[PDB]
Amino acid sequence: VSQVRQNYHSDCEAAVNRMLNLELYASYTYSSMYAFFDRDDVALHNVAEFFKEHSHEEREHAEKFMKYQNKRGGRVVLQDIKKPERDEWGNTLEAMQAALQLEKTVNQALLDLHKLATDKVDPHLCDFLESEYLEEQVKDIKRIGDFITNLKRLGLPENGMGEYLFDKHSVK
Amino acid sequence: VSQVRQNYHSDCEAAVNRMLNLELYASYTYSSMYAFFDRDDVALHNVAEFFKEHSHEEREHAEKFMKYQNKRGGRVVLQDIKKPERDEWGNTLEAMQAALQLEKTVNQALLDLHKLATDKVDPHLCDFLESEYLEEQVKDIKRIGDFITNLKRLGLPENGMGEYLFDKHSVK
Amino acid sequence: VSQVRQNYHSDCEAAVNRMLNLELYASYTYSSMYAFFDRDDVALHNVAEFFKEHSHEEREHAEKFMKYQNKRGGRVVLQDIKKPERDEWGNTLEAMQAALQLEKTVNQALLDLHKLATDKVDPHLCDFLESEYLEEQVKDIKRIGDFITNLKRLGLPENGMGEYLFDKHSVK
Amino acid sequence: VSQVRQNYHSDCEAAVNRMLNLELYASYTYSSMYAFFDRDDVALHNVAEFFKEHSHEEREHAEKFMKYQNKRGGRVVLQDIKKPERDEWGNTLEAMQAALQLEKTVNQALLDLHKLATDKVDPHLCDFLESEYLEEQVKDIKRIGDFITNLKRLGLPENGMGEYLFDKHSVK
């Protein structure tokens, strides 16, 4: 074992590797939303850029895990990044609804990770997740939730002036 | 009697204590409207912050009467601050309409106070009322009435696009 | 069910509503203390200002819990804010001892809430309480304890000159 | 009659002259207390300067009445300025107690002038009295009240370490 490894359970190491995969999957999905809203026949540029920024964010979350794995003495093991569920995202409402499901899925995985670490009595990994991830998740989820509420208020999916207005005002 | 007391009728003192509690009560109701507009399923952040600022003001108006009571040599006597009369405020129209009836209630308490001080021949408390409250109140009633007219023109309560537009332009 | 709610127990959600009411209770007691030390027959102005500033801090604590509730998908429900235990606070020593009991009471409720979040496995709420409340509680209690010690040193309640010196040098 | 006179009852013009002479009387008395605390066997310089300042304030108040009289088209008619009631002022507490009765005497004159103005339906004079005099009076009374309470706590008139401390801390 690593000269550095101390109080890092084997099951935790594996879990981080799986969690790193999920962030990357999340980043690839968002990247797809970006390409969708940028299509000439969708053309919602501010919406597109929103998904693009979230793409980079998730990718960073993943790198942060690689860094973390090494600090504790774990070994990063990488796995295919699965393509996203859809090639085409419907419209701003569907996309935000898909974004919420994805975010809630990542969050659930982080909460399970924290449950493992609790049972393994790894307070360092507990604090890492509390500090760097848990709070960012609840915040990303509130912002998407707010957007969905506004999208519905503006009459999506049927109201195109609503979708236009949202992209000019809510996002940026 | 306080060594500072001069021409301060004990009825006015009691009135000032009642008036102070009302300010706090109004402040607490705007708090409530703030938290309501901030829920994920309501998500009107500019309207929310408008009500935050109005609750901060009302609390200040209340503090100003604590100082005032002491300046005159009267004694501050606190009472329970009553919960606001709703837990959900429906929509921005109902909210502003609740707000209007609130401002009017407060204003009427302020005028009855001025009447009292007038009949007790207390010009100091008359002038304090005139300079620090009565003018601030008609501006707040005017603003809220303007908001209300705008919300109606925008087709509240049925028109969500209009509720959305109100949050992006009438407030900030 | 809030589109945003995840791993947030209703027992925890009610406890947050209870804690929010306590922070406001605290805040109101500190107001009372501000108004008492401002009296022409008390007239210890730096002591008043200390208490006014605690009355703000405890109020901001209550607003954090409102946001918190909405971030997590819970719901603010407000209750009457009880008036304070005393209309008069005796002197600086008696005030500080009452503040001590209040912070300790506020502190224990936070400790209880933490225990609940734990039993219910809500790491986000535990970390929130750790980072935003627990620490400040502990510093606050320390400051007041220190104060009570110097006021005793200064001869309170009997030594008027000691009381005047404390207000001149221990706060501002 | 003055080309300018309008809605100015002669009872008022005369009361103004009485009020003017009274300010000058109060100014002189404060003067006396300045020279008392500047005595080599009194030597409380911060206390003496406080009274020196009030002396100039009360004189600015008399000058302001002259100007008023002329604006309304009254005529200044000056009287003797009666020497202050004492040549010697005991100590700080005694002097503060005297200043209190003096300020309240001035205040009561100001209130009687307002009542006059009200009975004669002179709103101009009422606003002048309210704006330039009345608020400033309760302010000066509250301060002197605060001072006395502190001189008492400092153990005056017997505790001279008290009197020394009050000069160094309560005033400047």
XYZ file of C-alpha atoms in Angstrom:
688
model
C 0.000 0.000 0.000
C 0.865 3.691 -0.568
C 3.354 5.098 1.876
C 0.733 7.783 2.399
C -2.407 5.639 2.823
C -3.917 6.138 6.316
C -7.490 5.316 7.374
C -8.633 5.138 3.784
C -10.896 2.119 3.383
C -10.720 0.049 0.238
C -14.492 0.431 -0.370
C -14.144 4.181 -0.237
C -11.419 4.159 -2.830
C -13.666 2.212 -5.196
C -16.577 4.527 -4.505
C -14.601 7.647 -5.347
C -13.633 6.086 -8.662
C -17.329 5.410 -9.437
C -18.340 8.895 -8.333
C -15.653 10.416 -10.600
C -17.254 8.431 -13.455
C -20.683 9.954 -12.653
C -19.421 13.570 -12.684
C -17.891 12.902 -16.120
C -21.218 11.404 -17.279
C -22.958 14.438 -15.954
C -20.549 16.698 -17.790
C -21.061 14.901 -21.050
C -24.843 15.183 -20.819
C -24.668 18.920 -20.146
C -22.290 19.283 -23.009
C -24.945 17.671 -25.235
C -27.573 20.237 -24.038
C -25.143 22.930 -25.013
C -24.857 21.538 -28.596
C -28.672 21.182 -28.775
C -29.561 24.785 -27.835
C -26.908 26.048 -30.234
C -28.581 24.400 -33.245
C -29.914 26.853 -35.820
C -33.383 25.448 -35.369
C -33.307 25.774 -31.596
C -31.163 28.867 -31.152
C -31.324 29.709 -27.458
C -27.826 31.065 -26.890
C -28.002 31.993 -23.275
C -29.571 28.657 -22.446
C -26.807 26.927 -24.416
C -24.066 28.821 -22.481
C -25.717 27.944 -19.189
C -25.407 24.271 -19.996
C -21.874 24.819 -21.251
C -20.824 26.402 -17.898
C -22.359 23.456 -16.037
C -20.479 21.135 -18.263
C -17.164 22.661 -17.123
C -18.274 22.722 -13.512
C -18.982 18.958 -13.377
C -15.738 18.213 -15.163
C -13.929 20.147 -12.395
C -15.805 18.149 -9.730
C -14.354 15.015 -11.401
C -10.745 16.363 -11.446
C -11.149 17.305 -7.833
C -11.873 13.615 -7.162
C -8.736 12.492 -9.022
C -6.742 14.881 -6.874
C -8.482 13.617 -3.747
C -7.952 9.941 -4.570
C -4.170 10.592 -4.877
C -3.944 12.653 -1.684
C -5.275 9.727 0.386
C -3.205 7.150 -1.484
C -5.987 5.746 -3.638
C -5.520 4.734 -7.242
C -7.583 6.375 -9.889
C -9.117 3.763 -12.226
C -11.006 5.163 -15.251
C -13.989 3.703 -17.023
C -15.926 4.480 -20.223
C -17.956 7.681 -20.189
C -21.399 6.591 -21.350
C -23.103 8.736 -23.972
C -26.206 10.673 -22.772
C -29.779 9.283 -22.787
C -31.036 11.622 -25.538
C -29.591 13.095 -28.709
C -32.169 15.858 -28.739
C -33.550 17.651 -25.668
C -37.004 18.739 -26.718
C -36.995 22.290 -25.365
C -35.871 24.383 -22.407
C -38.386 22.819 -20.059
C -37.545 19.210 -20.917
C -33.871 20.005 -20.667
C -34.184 21.654 -17.224
C -36.318 18.711 -16.077
C -33.623 16.305 -17.308
C -31.019 18.551 -15.634
C -32.866 18.262 -12.289
C -33.063 14.401 -12.465
C -29.355 14.301 -13.268
C -28.429 16.671 -10.467
C -30.617 14.683 -7.996
C -28.885 11.480 -9.121
C -25.403 12.938 -8.559
C -26.533 14.243 -5.147
C -27.840 10.820 -4.150
C -24.563 9.270 -5.073
C -22.673 11.864 -3.000
C -25.007 11.254 -0.061
C -24.439 7.517 -0.273
C -20.658 8.159 -0.444
C -20.857 10.159 2.677
C -22.875 7.307 4.316
C -20.133 4.820 3.436
C -17.499 7.120 4.854
C -19.484 7.638 7.993
C -19.660 3.852 8.647
C -15.956 3.515 7.820
C -15.183 6.382 10.235
C -13.307 8.488 7.682
C -13.910 11.990 8.950
C -11.504 13.455 6.323
C -13.615 12.093 3.457
C -16.756 13.225 5.292
C -15.488 16.756 5.532
C -14.268 16.754 1.949
C -17.759 15.973 0.657
C -19.512 18.369 3.091
C -17.145 21.228 2.182
C -16.605 20.780 -1.587
C -19.797 19.049 -2.942
C -22.880 18.713 -0.761
C -23.579 22.440 -0.577
C -22.868 23.087 -4.271
C -25.383 20.408 -5.024
C -28.218 21.836 -2.990
C -27.559 25.202 -4.627
C -27.473 23.900 -8.223
C -30.727 22.029 -7.501
C -32.512 25.088 -6.111
C -31.502 27.201 -9.142
C -32.793 24.557 -11.566
C -35.972 24.131 -9.544
C -36.562 27.912 -9.749
C -36.019 27.881 -13.523
C -38.542 25.021 -13.964
C -41.121 26.981 -11.963
C -40.518 30.027 -14.152
C -40.590 28.004 -17.329
C -44.014 26.687 -16.350
C -45.250 30.204 -15.437
C -44.181 31.397 -18.874
C -46.286 28.596 -20.423
C -43.886 25.916 -21.619
C -43.861 23.763 -23.652
C -46.500 25.482 -25.821
C -45.583 29.135 -25.349
C -42.673 30.171 -27.580
C -42.692 33.831 -26.446
C -42.330 32.410 -22.983
C -39.296 30.431 -24.018
C -37.811 33.488 -25.731
C -38.335 35.700 -22.644
C -36.739 33.133 -20.308
C -33.510 32.986 -22.290
C -33.267 36.840 -22.318
C -33.952 37.343 -18.569
C -33.633 34.298 -16.261
C -30.322 33.020 -17.487
C -26.921 34.835 -17.486
C -41.334 60.254 36.966
C -38.236 60.441 34.787
C -36.045 63.528 35.372
C -36.271 64.144 31.632
C -40.053 64.052 31.277
C -41.757 67.221 30.185
C -45.127 67.598 28.506
C -45.330 63.923 27.723
C -48.752 62.595 28.475
C -48.952 59.037 29.727
C -51.663 58.217 27.065
C -49.193 59.108 24.304
C -46.573 56.959 25.978
C -48.991 54.042 25.919
C -49.857 54.841 22.237
C -46.159 54.907 21.271
C -45.728 51.422 22.842
C -48.754 50.147 20.840
C -47.370 51.844 17.698
C -43.984 50.250 18.080
C -45.499 46.704 18.283
C -47.469 47.361 15.103
C -44.259 48.321 13.272
C -42.754 45.000 14.363
C -45.903 43.210 13.351
C -45.755 44.720 9.839
C -42.050 43.865 9.644
C -42.820 40.243 10.446
C -45.471 40.053 7.718
C -43.080 41.279 5.080
C -40.615 38.666 6.320
C -43.220 36.123 5.569
C -43.788 37.490 2.064
C -40.052 37.413 1.498
C -39.732 33.693 2.401
C -42.804 32.914 0.320
C -41.500 34.496 -2.876
C -38.250 32.659 -2.318
C -39.710 29.123 -2.273
C -38.714 27.004 -5.279
C -42.276 26.669 -6.456
C -42.865 30.424 -6.409
C -39.372 31.696 -7.409
C -39.884 35.437 -7.900
C -36.562 36.702 -6.524
C -36.937 40.411 -7.138
C -40.369 40.531 -5.535
C -38.828 38.551 -2.663
C -36.109 41.116 -2.131
C -38.556 43.948 -2.334
C -40.371 42.452 0.634
C -37.073 41.830 2.448
C -36.281 45.575 2.186
C -39.724 46.539 3.385
C -39.384 44.296 6.440
C -35.987 45.867 7.274
C -37.556 49.368 7.108
C -40.486 48.541 9.375
C -38.113 47.144 11.987
C -36.100 50.385 11.741
C -39.260 52.444 12.191
C -39.820 50.399 15.320
C -36.313 51.012 16.706
C -36.807 54.690 16.049
C -39.818 54.641 18.433
C -37.778 52.823 21.116
C -35.260 55.703 20.960
C -38.092 58.147 20.858
C -39.760 56.759 23.981
C -36.438 57.013 25.883
C -35.692 60.517 24.596
C -38.960 61.712 26.068
C -38.458 59.892 29.307
C -41.212 57.368 28.663
C -40.761 53.611 29.141
C -40.682 50.959 26.443
C -42.938 48.039 27.209
C -42.801 45.161 24.795
C -45.562 42.720 23.764
C -45.717 39.480 21.735
C -45.284 40.056 17.972
C -48.257 38.357 16.311
C -47.642 35.827 13.501
C -48.734 37.200 10.048
C -52.258 36.260 9.097
C -51.322 33.921 6.252
C -48.688 31.276 5.705
C -48.828 31.427 1.891
C -49.481 34.621 -0.050
C -50.966 33.115 -3.198
C -49.267 35.216 -5.929
C -47.732 38.707 -6.384
C -51.147 40.321 -6.760
C -52.589 38.929 -3.472
C -49.300 39.747 -1.856
C -49.300 43.428 -2.886
C -52.966 43.661 -1.987
C -52.245 42.264 1.480
C -49.315 44.753 1.611
C -51.562 47.667 0.767
C -54.062 46.892 3.536
C -51.126 46.567 5.876
C -49.634 49.938 4.960
C -53.077 51.485 5.429
C -53.593 49.928 8.813
C -50.203 51.220 9.917
C -50.860 54.675 8.460
C -54.231 54.918 10.261
C -52.572 53.969 13.582
C -50.021 56.718 12.847
C -52.771 59.267 12.215
C -54.695 58.336 15.345
C -51.425 58.887 17.149
C -51.030 62.317 15.605
C -54.640 63.204 16.568
C -53.831 62.055 20.175
C -50.682 64.110 20.401
C -52.625 67.025 18.937
C -55.314 66.856 21.624
C -52.633 66.442 24.348
C -50.897 69.515 22.920
C -47.603 67.665 22.243
C -45.975 69.442 19.293
C -42.714 67.568 19.640
C -44.337 64.218 19.015
C -46.509 65.738 16.259
C -43.419 66.924 14.391
C -41.632 63.589 14.890
C -44.619 61.794 13.421
C -44.791 64.242 10.491
C -41.067 64.151 9.603
C -40.206 60.486 10.097
C -43.377 58.544 9.289
C -46.368 60.180 7.659
C -44.501 61.220 4.512
C -42.765 57.838 4.255
C -46.132 56.135 4.435
C -47.902 57.907 1.620
C -44.944 57.196 -0.692
C -45.142 53.485 0.230
C -48.929 53.366 -0.360
C -48.490 55.192 -3.680
C -45.791 52.731 -4.789
C -47.877 49.704 -3.800
C -50.974 51.094 -5.531
C -48.850 51.630 -8.672
C -47.688 48.044 -8.430
C -51.205 46.791 -8.055
C -52.471 48.689 -11.152
C -49.555 47.216 -13.123
C -50.140 43.674 -11.960
C -53.828 44.004 -13.066
C -52.925 45.407 -16.470
C -50.508 42.445 -16.805
C -53.452 40.081 -16.349
C -52.757 38.814 -12.871
C -53.713 36.393 -11.386
C -54.159 34.254 -14.534
C -51.292 35.562 -16.619
C -47.934 34.086 -15.547
C -45.991 35.724 -18.320
C -47.166 38.989 -16.839
C -46.262 38.015 -13.285
C -42.831 37.089 -14.651
C -42.488 40.439 -16.432
C -43.483 42.365 -13.346
C -40.553 40.736 -11.466
C -38.035 41.665 -14.177
C -39.121 45.328 -14.653
C -41.367 46.931 -11.956
C -38.963 45.843 -9.144
C -35.150 45.736 -8.673
C -43.767 17.308 -2.627
C -41.195 20.080 -3.466
C -39.434 19.267 -6.781
C -36.211 20.061 -4.931
C -36.607 18.091 -1.646
C -33.989 15.350 -1.180
C -32.993 13.555 2.015
C -34.803 16.197 4.137
C -36.864 14.746 6.971
C -40.085 16.433 8.057
C -38.960 16.126 11.672
C -35.884 18.100 10.797
C -37.981 20.562 8.848
C -40.170 21.293 11.915
C -37.123 21.646 14.114
C -35.755 24.315 11.772
C -39.084 26.156 12.114
C -38.746 25.854 15.949
C -35.142 27.084 15.864
C -36.080 29.990 13.642
C -38.600 31.101 16.300
C -35.949 30.877 19.040
C -33.409 32.965 17.121
C -36.157 35.643 16.806
C -36.901 35.308 20.570
C -33.248 35.850 21.362
C -33.246 38.793 18.942
C -36.243 40.384 20.732
C -34.689 39.907 24.220
C -31.567 41.686 23.026
C -33.727 44.574 21.802
C -35.202 44.886 25.223
C -31.731 45.109 26.650
C -30.772 47.812 24.131
C -33.805 49.912 25.117
C -33.067 49.440 28.869
C -29.450 50.557 28.767
C -30.503 53.524 26.614
C -32.844 54.839 29.393
C -32.007 58.232 30.809
C -31.895 56.573 34.285
C -29.537 53.854 33.063
C -27.511 55.565 30.414
C -24.778 53.066 29.621
C -24.628 53.706 25.823
C -21.796 51.356 24.710
C -23.553 48.508 26.595
C -26.821 49.355 24.791
C -25.001 49.320 21.423
C -23.504 45.930 22.203
C -26.951 44.572 22.782
C -28.440 46.269 19.732
C -25.741 44.574 17.648
C -26.571 41.165 19.182
C -30.189 41.802 18.412
C -29.140 42.153 14.770
C -26.929 39.071 14.750
C -29.678 36.836 16.154
C -32.139 38.239 13.614
C -29.706 37.419 10.725
C -29.449 33.948 12.193
C -33.231 33.648 11.774
C -33.110 34.790 8.117
C -30.442 32.190 7.340
C -32.834 29.518 8.567
C -35.596 30.849 6.285
C -33.331 30.657 3.206
C -32.134 27.288 4.456
C -35.617 25.944 4.665
C -36.348 27.076 1.074
C -32.981 25.795 -0.311
C -33.835 22.331 0.994
C -37.418 22.346 -0.230
C -38.947 22.696 3.256
C -41.319 25.483 4.218
C -41.185 28.334 6.636
C -44.015 28.381 9.084
C -43.986 31.308 11.447
C -45.311 31.660 14.993
C -45.856 34.544 17.435
C -42.585 35.921 18.793
C -42.889 35.816 22.594
C -42.190 39.017 24.499
C -39.077 38.909 26.791
C -38.928 37.578 30.355
C -38.247 41.033 31.893
C -39.193 44.630 31.113
C -36.203 45.784 33.108
C -32.784 44.203 33.282
C -31.410 45.582 36.609
C -27.799 46.385 35.643
C -24.923 45.349 33.415
C -24.156 42.253 35.530
C -27.749 41.003 35.593
C -27.990 41.656 31.858
C -24.847 39.684 31.011
C -25.944 36.722 33.175
C -29.310 36.684 31.398
C -27.498 36.883 28.024
C -25.372 33.967 29.200
C -28.455 31.856 29.946
C -30.038 32.858 26.602
C -26.983 31.900 24.463
C -26.700 28.616 26.375
C -30.435 27.946 25.696
C -30.021 28.902 22.013
C -26.872 26.858 21.976
C -28.532 23.668 23.320
C -31.392 23.857 20.835
C -28.759 23.943 18.118
C -27.094 20.985 19.689
C -30.426 19.085 19.739
C -31.149 19.947 16.123
C -27.730 18.659 15.183
C -28.519 15.373 16.985
C -31.754 15.009 15.068
C -30.047 15.675 11.691
C -27.600 12.973 12.621
C -30.142 10.370 13.715
C -31.887 11.117 10.431
C -28.632 11.086 8.357
C -28.737 14.569 6.864
C -25.032 15.538 6.385
C -25.927 18.833 4.658
C -27.888 20.096 7.648
C -25.213 18.997 10.127
C -22.513 20.844 8.233
C -24.754 23.882 7.913
C -25.203 24.015 11.677
C -21.459 23.374 12.213
C -20.283 26.137 9.865
C -22.889 28.835 10.379
C -24.023 28.493 14.035
C -22.091 26.228 16.428
C -18.836 28.126 16.156
C -20.382 31.583 16.690
C -22.385 30.277 19.625
C -19.177 29.168 21.278
C -17.353 32.513 20.685
C -20.401 34.418 21.922
C -20.646 32.446 25.125
C -16.901 32.949 25.716
C -17.203 36.738 25.295
C -20.067 36.989 27.689
C -18.341 34.718 30.297
C -15.263 36.938 30.053
C -17.480 39.950 30.618
C -19.258 38.499 33.662
C -15.810 37.874 35.159
C -14.668 41.476 34.673
C -17.904 42.892 35.948
C -17.442 40.804 39.110
C -13.868 41.949 39.264
C -15.108 45.519 38.939
C -17.334 45.188 41.987
C -20.774 44.849 40.330
C -23.587 45.106 41.370
C -22.502 47.529 44.163
C -19.607 49.378 42.553
C -21.099 52.107 40.276
C -17.626 53.260 39.286
C -16.770 49.743 38.143
C -19.916 49.679 35.978
C -19.015 52.988 34.334
C -15.438 51.818 33.605
C -16.668 48.570 31.997
C -18.877 50.475 29.614
C -15.965 52.764 28.776
C -13.295 50.060 28.154
C -14.748 46.592 27.734
C -17.065 47.396 24.815
C -17.166 49.888 21.856
C -47.191 98.195 9.915
C -44.336 96.542 8.048
C -44.838 96.044 4.255
C -43.972 92.426 5.013
C -46.225 91.609 7.989
C -48.784 88.873 7.333
C -50.637 86.631 9.779
C -48.287 87.851 12.585
C -50.180 88.623 15.842
C -48.544 91.203 18.069
C -48.814 88.866 21.101
C -46.391 86.669 19.178
C -43.952 89.392 18.131
C -43.724 90.249 21.836
C -43.378 86.681 23.048
C -40.569 86.287 20.521
C -38.744 89.150 22.203
C -39.282 87.524 25.598
C -38.003 84.185 24.204
C -35.016 85.899 22.675
C -34.012 87.520 25.965
C -34.399 84.154 27.695
C -31.947 82.415 25.340
C -29.409 85.155 26.060
C -30.016 84.632 29.805
C -29.328 80.915 29.389
C -26.348 81.714 27.283
C -24.853 83.892 30.085
C -25.462 81.213 32.727
C -23.586 78.633 30.672
C -20.858 81.176 30.308
C -20.647 81.393 34.093
C -20.210 77.647 34.372
C -17.436 77.788 31.797
C -15.469 80.220 33.965
C -16.271 78.176 37.044
C -14.758 74.906 35.712
C -11.730 76.830 34.348
C -10.775 78.039 37.917
C -7.383 76.705 39.054
C -9.134 75.136 42.053
C -11.740 73.511 39.937
C -9.770 72.467 36.847
C -12.220 70.239 34.923
C -11.505 71.420 31.355
C -13.589 69.019 29.376
C -16.566 70.011 31.584
C -15.819 73.690 31.168
C -15.665 73.377 27.357
C -18.974 71.541 27.299
C -20.613 74.532 28.949
C -18.606 76.900 26.737
C -20.188 75.140 23.742
C -23.769 75.230 25.055
C -23.201 78.844 25.734
C -22.564 79.497 22.051
C -25.431 77.263 20.963
C -27.922 79.268 23.172
C -26.583 82.517 21.789
C -26.998 81.163 18.215
C -30.565 80.449 19.202
C -31.113 84.058 20.266
C -29.549 85.406 17.080
C -31.921 83.113 15.120
C -34.926 84.703 16.791
C -33.750 88.193 15.820
C -33.653 87.115 12.192
C -37.089 85.530 12.462
C -38.626 88.662 13.923
C -37.346 90.622 10.969
C -38.465 88.017 8.386
C -42.057 88.162 9.730
C -41.802 91.936 10.036
C -41.804 92.168 13.820
C -39.382 94.482 15.631
C -36.583 93.368 17.917
C -36.885 95.089 21.305
C -34.024 94.103 23.624
C -33.987 93.951 27.454
C -31.257 93.677 30.143
C -29.588 90.281 30.274
C -29.918 89.328 33.969
C -26.744 87.988 35.613
C -26.858 84.207 36.374
C -28.291 83.108 39.706
C -24.900 81.982 41.113
C -21.226 82.898 40.951
C -20.064 79.488 41.952
C -21.476 76.122 40.857
C -20.339 73.632 43.489
C -19.215 70.716 41.323
C -20.150 68.892 38.129
C -23.304 67.246 39.450
C -24.587 70.482 40.915
C -23.911 72.322 37.694
C -25.536 69.543 35.623
C -28.611 69.624 37.887
C -28.827 73.403 37.359
C -28.354 73.096 33.577
C -31.257 70.637 33.508
C -33.680 73.079 35.217
C -32.404 75.777 32.931
C -32.952 73.735 29.758
C -36.449 72.699 30.901
C -37.195 76.294 31.643
C -36.208 77.235 28.123
C -38.193 74.257 26.754
C -41.380 75.314 28.578
C -41.046 78.797 27.272
C -40.681 77.252 23.779
C -43.791 75.140 24.283
C -45.761 78.123 25.532
C -44.681 80.067 22.484
C -45.901 77.225 20.292
C -49.267 77.077 22.031
C -49.578 80.828 21.509
C -48.699 80.374 17.798
C -51.304 77.588 17.531
C -54.063 79.727 19.149
C -53.323 82.542 16.735
C -53.245 80.156 13.746
C -49.654 80.941 12.743
C -48.366 77.820 11.033
C -45.165 79.496 9.942
C -44.101 80.130 13.529
C -45.131 76.631 14.575
C -42.880 75.060 11.929
C -39.983 77.300 12.896
C -40.381 76.454 16.562
C -40.667 72.709 15.679
C -37.683 72.612 13.285
C -35.029 74.846 14.835
C -35.732 74.572 18.575
C -37.957 71.765 19.967
C -36.071 68.651 18.793
C -32.818 70.242 19.798
C -34.218 70.802 23.282
C -35.247 67.265 24.002
C -31.846 66.191 22.676
C -29.979 68.494 25.144
C -32.254 67.414 27.965
C -31.704 63.742 27.260
C -27.921 64.280 27.268
C -27.859 66.157 30.514
C -30.135 63.518 32.009
C -27.675 60.807 30.874
C -24.804 62.811 32.424
C -26.490 63.220 35.836
C -27.273 59.469 36.046
C -23.543 58.815 35.414
C -22.311 61.467 37.899
C -24.515 59.664 40.451
C -23.129 56.237 39.603
C -19.632 57.708 39.796
C -20.473 58.563 43.449
C -20.758 62.371 43.174
C -20.604 64.736 45.021
C -18.290 62.855 47.478
C -16.211 60.642 45.146
C -13.720 62.994 43.422
C -12.146 60.152 41.490
C -15.599 59.895 39.984
C -15.688 63.555 38.969
C -12.211 63.130 37.383
C -13.275 59.994 35.393
C -16.476 61.737 34.059
C -14.451 64.644 32.732
C -12.065 62.311 30.953
C -14.645 59.910 29.427
C -18.278 61.196 29.315
C -17.535 64.522 27.642
C -15.658 65.730 24.489
